[PDB]
C-alpha cells in the first residue's frame, strides 16, 4: 500500500530525529512583541528575530512551576516530539533553549489565529467546512499514531489556521510516545475520553474520541458534553449519552456515534481496520485524502492578515515582565532540554 510505505518512511525519519536531542538560540536574539495566548505554566508570544527580521511564536515555560506541578516529563516530551515530527499540519519548531528561569520553544508563527475564535465568531461551521478541518486531523492522527505517539489535547484552541486556511496543530504539552496503555490524567475537560475519567488506562483511542467532540463542536457550535461544574461534564461523558442537533446530517450523526462510542470494542479508529473505518465512512465519501495532504484543496475560509507580525486574529492579553532569575533554577531537572 502507498500509505503503509509512506508511514514506514515517516517512522524512519522520526526515530532519527528522536535521538537528535540543544540550545539553538537565546532570549537575547528576539524582540518580544505581544502575547498570543496565556497558559498555566506561561505564555506564547509573538517575537521577532532582531537580526533576520523573521517573526516566530515563542512558548515560555517557567521551570519552577513545571517542577512544582510534576510536569517535567511532559515538558521534555513536548519539546522532543515537536522537534522530531514532520507533517504538513504540525507546527514547525525553529528554535528551543533554556535559561535560569524558563524553557523556550520558538515555533513558526501561524498568524491566522485559533480555530476557536473563528468558530465562536462564525457560530458554527458548515459540514463541508467542518469536514475540511477534520480530514486534516484524521491524517495527522494516522501519522502520529503510526509513530506510537498519542496527542491528548485536541480542541479548537490548539488548532491554528495558516495563511492558506489549513490547520497547524500546536500545544504538544501532553504528547507522549506510547506503545500500550498510559495512565496520566490530562487533556481538556470537555474533550476527555471516558477511559481517562474512569482511570482505566488508555491508548491512542482517546484521540479518536476527541476528534468526535471536535467534529461535533465545529458543526454544532458547542461541544456535546458541557456543564457548569466539571463533575457534571464527566458524568455526561461517562454516561454514553449524546444528543445531536436536528440540522446534523444522518451521515454526520452516524460517524459521531461511532467515534463517541464509550465502548472501546466499538469506537472507530480502534477497530481491526484502524483509521480506515473513519476514512471510508460515508460522511467522508467526497474527501480526496491525497489532495488534502498535498494541500491542493481550496480552503473554505482564509483569514486575513496585514503583513508579517500582524496579530489581529488573536485576542488581547494582559502583558507582563518576563521574570528571569540571576540564579539558575532546576538545572538538574532539565538537563535533557
Amino acid at each position: 500500500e502507498s500509505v503503509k510505505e509512506f508511514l514506514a518512511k515517516a517512522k524512519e525519519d522520526f526515530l532519527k530525529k528522536w535521538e537528535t536531542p540543544q540550545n539553538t538560540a537565546q532570549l537575547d536574539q528576539f524582540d518580544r512583541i505581544k502575547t498570543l495566548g496565556t497558559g498555566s505554566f506561561g505564555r506564547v508570544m509573538l517575537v521577532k528575530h532582531k537580526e533576520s527580521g523573521n517573526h516566530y511564536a515563542m512558548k515560555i515555560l517557567d521551570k519552577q512551576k513545571v517542577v512544582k506541578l510534576k510536569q517535567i516529563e511532559h515538558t521534555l516530551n513536548e519539546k522532543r516530539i515537536l522537534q522530531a515530527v514532520n507533517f504538513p499540519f504540525l507546527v514547525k519548531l525553529e528554535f528551543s533553549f533554556k535559561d535560569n528561569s524558563n524553557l523556550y520553544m520558538v515555533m513558526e508563527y501561524v498568524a491566522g489565529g485559533e480555530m476557536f475564535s473563528h468558530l465562536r465568531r462564525i457560530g458554527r461551521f458548515s459540514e463541508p467546512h467542518a469536514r475540511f478541518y477534520a480530514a486534516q486531523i484524521v491524517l495527522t492522527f494516522e501519522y502520529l499514531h503510526s509513530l506510537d505517539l498519542i496527542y491528548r489535547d485536541l480542541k479548537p484552541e490548539n488548532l491554528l489556521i495558516d495563511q492558506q486556511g489549513y490547520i497547524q496543530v500546536t500545544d504538544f504539552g501532553f504528547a507522549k510516545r506510547v506503545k500500550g496503555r498510559t495512565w496520566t490524567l490530562c487533556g481538556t475537560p470537555e474533550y476527555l475520553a471516558p477511559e481517562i475519567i474512569l482511570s482505566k488506562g488508555y491508548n491512542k483511542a482517546v484521540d479518536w474520541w476527541a476528534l468526535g467532540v471536535l467534529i461535533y463542536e465545529m458543526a454544532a457550535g458547542y461541544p456535546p458534553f458541557f456543564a457548569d461544574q466539571p463533575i457534571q461534564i464527566y458524568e455526561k461523558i461517562v454516561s454514553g449519552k449524546v444528543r445531536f442537533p436536528s440540522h446534523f446530517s444522518s451521515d454526520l450523526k452516524d460517524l459521531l456515534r461511532n467515534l463517541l462510542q464509550v465502548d472501546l470494542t466499538k469506537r472507530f479508529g480502534n477497530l481491526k481496520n484502524g483509521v480506515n473505518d473513519i476514512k471510508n465512512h460515508k460522511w467522508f465519501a467526497t474527501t480526496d485524502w491525497i489532495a488534502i495532504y498535498q494541500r491542493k484543496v481550496e480552503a473554505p475560509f482564509i483569514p486575513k492578515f496585514k503583513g508579517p507580525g500582524d496579530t489581529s486574529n488573536f485576542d488581547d492579553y494582559e502583558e507582563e515582565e518576563i521574570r528571569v532569575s540571576i540564579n539558575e533554577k532546576c538545572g538538574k531537572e532539565f538537563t535533557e532540554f
Binding site: 489535547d153 475537560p189 470537555e190
Partner: peptide, 12 residues
Amino acid sequence: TRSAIRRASTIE
C-alpha cells in the same frame, strides 16, 4: 461580539 471563553487544559 459573541462570547468566546477559551478552555484550559487540566492535570491531576
